[PDB]
Design a protein around this nucleic acid. Sequence first.
DNA 1: CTGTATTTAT
DNA 2: GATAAATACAGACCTAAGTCCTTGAATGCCGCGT
DNA 3: ACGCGGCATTCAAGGACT
Lengths: 257, 255, 253, 319, 246
Amino acid sequence: MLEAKFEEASLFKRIIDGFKDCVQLVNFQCKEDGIIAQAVDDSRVLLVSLEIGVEAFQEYRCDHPVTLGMDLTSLSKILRCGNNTDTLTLIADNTPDSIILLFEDTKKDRIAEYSLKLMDIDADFLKIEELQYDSTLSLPSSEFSKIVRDLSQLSDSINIMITKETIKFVADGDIGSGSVIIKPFVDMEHPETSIKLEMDQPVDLTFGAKYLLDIIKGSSLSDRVGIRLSSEAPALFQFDLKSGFLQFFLAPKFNDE
Amino acid sequence: MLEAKFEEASLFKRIIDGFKDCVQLVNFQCKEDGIIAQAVDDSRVLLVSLEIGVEAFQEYRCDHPVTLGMDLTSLSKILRCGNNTDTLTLIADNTPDSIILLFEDTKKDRIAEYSLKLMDIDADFLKIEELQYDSTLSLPSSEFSKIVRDLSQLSDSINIMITKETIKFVADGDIGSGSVIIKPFVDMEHPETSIKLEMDQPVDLTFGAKYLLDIIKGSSLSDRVGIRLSSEAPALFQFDLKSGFLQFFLAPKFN
Amino acid sequence: MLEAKFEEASLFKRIIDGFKDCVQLVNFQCKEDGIIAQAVDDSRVLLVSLEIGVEAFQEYRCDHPVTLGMDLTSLSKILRCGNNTDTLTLIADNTPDSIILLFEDTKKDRIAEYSLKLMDIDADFLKIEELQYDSTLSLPSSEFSKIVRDLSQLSDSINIMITKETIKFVADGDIGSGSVIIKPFVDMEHPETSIKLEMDQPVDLTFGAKYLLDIIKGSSLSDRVGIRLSSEAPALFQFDLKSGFLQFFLAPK
Amino acid sequence: TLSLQLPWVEKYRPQVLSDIVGNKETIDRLQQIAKDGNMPHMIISGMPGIGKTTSVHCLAHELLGRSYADGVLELNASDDRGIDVVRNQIKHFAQKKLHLPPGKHKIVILDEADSMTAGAQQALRRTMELYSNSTRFAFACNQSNKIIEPLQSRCAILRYSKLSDEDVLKRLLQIIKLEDVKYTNDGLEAIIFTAEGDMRQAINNLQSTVAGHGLVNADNVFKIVDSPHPLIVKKMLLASNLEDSIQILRTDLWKKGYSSIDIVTTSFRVTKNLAQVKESVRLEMIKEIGLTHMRILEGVGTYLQLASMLAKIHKLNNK
Amino acid sequence: EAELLVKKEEERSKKLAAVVREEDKLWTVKYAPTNLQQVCGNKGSVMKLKNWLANWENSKKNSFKHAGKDGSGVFRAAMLYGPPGIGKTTAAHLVAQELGYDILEQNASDVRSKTLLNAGVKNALDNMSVVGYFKHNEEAQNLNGKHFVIIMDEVDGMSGGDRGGVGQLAQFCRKTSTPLILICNERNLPKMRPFDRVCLDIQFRRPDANSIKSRLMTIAIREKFKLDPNVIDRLIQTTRGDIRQV
DNA sequence: CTGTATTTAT
DNA sequence: GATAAATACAGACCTAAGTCCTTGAATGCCGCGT
DNA sequence: ACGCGGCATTCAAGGACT
Ligand SMILES: Nc1ncnc2c1ncn2[C@@H]1O[C@H](COP(=O)(O)OP(=O)(O)OP(O)(O)=S)[C@@H](O)[C@H]1O
Ligand SMILES: Nc1ncnc2c1ncn2[C@@H]1O[C@H](COP(=O)(O)OP(=O)(O)O)[C@@H](O)[C@H]1O
Ligand SMILES: [Mg+2]
Ligand SMILES: [Mg+2]
């Protein structure tokens, strides 16, 4: 069984709203540490890894490890059904066929239970191993979303050219082209606005536009983005949470000649 | 002749928008007591019974009984041609034909005269039956509309169950199921948020999602909606106005 | 070369949004004395003429006159790439290959650069004939747009009557009729909420609803619209910018 | 009366596979599948009223036991024939996880499947295979030709035939015994003859006869149910003399209220399906009937044109 | 082959002792070919497709201008078309599996509009596989693990016209950086005209009963039902060369 | 039907 | 290796017409967030 | 107030008609 009680339902609502426009079906692995989840995009170009630890839950109880296959659209609808201030409790029975979401408000005595039929998803639990990244970058999330949305109008390609103490984004399209250059700066007055750079080796890479839009769609989760680059390896895009994260593992374009 | 004047031109706008989607053909019959409107949907599943009273009109004059039929699609189009700060005037001659709508504001001298051709709608039964329903409840309109629109996504059928101080809305569909449980509570600090429920016998019937969503479009008229239920009887969805009421008579599904 | 530093990107955004669904390809004629833009629709019923002066620019410099053909939708896509607290800079070389749009921000750490590829379109001659108009009235843009959108529902033909200090808009449809009556009013408390009717001869003109809806799209530029009627000449639909005008010459039936 | 009694067709609809009388091989094969499990994909086709929907519904019920509520998706194809249905509802039902008895799987029943549009049918092709481990589709249609060949490839082609008179008589006798109706052998034979193998027609006609007159006799069943139009039309076409054909027309078709277009259409259908007449003469009579049909459709619908068509046919037969 | 299948079942049982039950599966999927040596008929087409997909990288290095010895080095995309149920999809999947590429399958009937096909398959054409990278890139036996083979099934069901995507895919397939394997049932269709000069046509024919005789005898011996080879030819003729339906 | 293509046989 | 059997398979796809239907693209209005 | 965000509604192209 499983009885996981969230502090708030808006957190899960925004989390599911973060990556419902990229992947449609996700397997939620609920283990004693929390709920780790990873699912491949339909195009098999992006991988979304989500972990939420027990510290997030007010009371998390699990008897046996079980798999939770869910549809993102139905989950988004169910979370839309609940109000912001309720405490959302996930209840699952043995041999789970449906998930009993429990929106409940302590101020009133209104109790709303929605049952989501569990989707049967068959996919391999491919392992994830970290590697040394030439470029580890953190930016304000709003600026990152704004620049990606701005250049995506011109073209379907985003080129991340990190020169020495420079971050240049270039898009080349049929009608017009655009380039944005960001200078690293750290402000003691406001840590959120500060920009941090680590450059082991320079890296030049080009990434798909729609996947980057789906990545920045998780801007609500964290104020600062976690961006790590490797020339021959997928770039990890991380949104940090209190007890977890929303990993985005994107594949680059072919850098022909 | 008829000269009915609204101090709030947006009031009639909101009333018409409440049941514009539900029905297209309605007979606006004007008497001395006030305007009474009644209409039936093409599928003949919902009954709309509007009753405006003289207190609503700033100036109301009806020399003789008159039956004014019009199309809601065109009449709503006519109403959207007026600003918020105007006073409406409904004009009809001795022989009912080509009703005239006047949008007038006297602060800035402006006149807006619009006309609508009347139509011969034969159905003029004009009957509603007062019944001692098994349950009579009242809840805020916004909460009921939120519940209806939230449960309409799961399936096309919404089941309402009335039990001893418990109101449950059940919707079971293909993607899952859901049920909202509320209880009748009285709040002295804010009376508007309170929920009342007077039940005689347990009630169990199911309605359609489309018609329920069409009914909750009337939540813009009154802040509270009263819902009365009975065993195999038309559910009465009542929105009380200042001078009258707007009632939706729904027909449940067959078990 | 051409160097024009706009006061605000939002202003040029509204000037472009004035005639989005009106024409698709235009050629901006850039000279020292501001920029001119003329377009003719496919039905040969309206003449969009856009004139903005030097005073509308914070800084404007153009030694060599240049023709600047652009596409409307891509230009709007370019415009939808900057913050509304930013200033626009138009910079071009003598070769008409690409147009460089520079976004400058008060904080010197955020710079945006964009380009717009030109297209070649057969330009049309200037229609600047100042024929006499019988009646001239000016009313706020928002109220006129509301009236046009309201009366376009009943019928697709708009009847405008100006006679004995009365302004009338009639739209007789199949479902009913529409008649908006407004008198000229001057208000000292607010200048923009005033009607200035100057009539020299009565006017009875019929206009298309779709074209009028296209014209009322430019209500975001100015708080008021100046409209002049002529029984033998196309009516002028003018919005008054800071130092420029957006004009529609609709040919009545 | 405010309330009504349930029709005999639906009240006595078979609830088990054994009650089905016709197509013994197919019923036994479906019963073996129900007992063993592992239901294969199938399309069931045939004539109206021979037990296609009943067979698939009984198969689903017996196979899934108490899990019919969730394991069975009921979707009338004519009502829902859009690619949106396949993309959203069918796909979500197929990906749905449901714990079942080992042999059994979830069943999709698409009645009247012949009316599905090309786009939805083509989109269903990959849904049929991708989720076959959990979901098994079943199709029922009047004509299998409307279903695309690749979809026919993925399923078993289980084809039905017109019900024999003996099986219809057996079912009618069972219902008669169960509901205590007075009958005669001639009346039952006439009901079987009028039904022409359509069991639903037979039961409806029995209902009508019982309710209207109370006794199942040949006289009553012929008054309440008219003789089949193609038979009188064929008798008119195959008469020896012209005057006989004219008399049969005047009495049985024109005076009884049958329309010109109905008469000419039924004559064409009978002529194309006739076997005794040689093909060449059949074709030339079809030509004359088609000319008369053209005149009727242009607007000249009268006894004169029908008599002229009969005269041309008789001249054609008389060389 | 019956004995080999029994041994395979025994090994599977031992592995399970140390999720769908086999008898639950249909005969079509439980006897699906696991390697290219079990496909019945159209051996030449399978060999040609295998050679094309193997020399695709070499032709890519030559920029596809050179045709090569076999000639399947000037075409970026290949089309497999034939009567339904003869094994085009199985052959494409198997040739993709053997050579080590990552299989990406899209049903064109499900996704036929310009918007969805455009976005998905465009960002699929020039992208590596995160599954291919995370699927043990460390060993160097398969270099093609990164790359994609997009086997677009049911190409015959795409929307027609300029607004339809069937004409867009013609412009789409010539500019691609990954192999494309289109499969359709009715190649000679008016909607499929833009595709003659941009794809390597491969006509899969109806296999002859002699080749499928062995497969039918194996699946009959395994399932404990008696089959006489004299009626196999009549079965194929009745079914018209459709192995799935037989 | 005639013409082209592919697989088993001589 | 060439030439016979033995056979599966491709040869080709138009313009109008009236009315219903479906599918995807383009369009509109209206609710939520800042 | 002011701008996006889905979602209902309107528009346009293709296929079928025994
Ligand atoms: N040549 C063959 N040899 C053996 N089994 C085959 C062969 N062709 C088809 N099959 C069987 O049929 C199943 C489906 O084959 P498919 O390749 O999907 O048929 P198809 O040629 O793609 O036609 P479709 O799917 O209607 S477009 C396979 O899993 C096999 O079990
Ligand atoms: N073979 C049969 N045995 C018994 N009853 C039958 C048979 N065929 C049809 N019926 C009767 O006809 C009624 C409806 O038939 P149905 O199965 O809907 O026809 P179809 O196969 O055309 O859908 C059922 O209630 C059933 O009682
Ligand atoms: Mg049926
Ligand atoms: Mg296939």
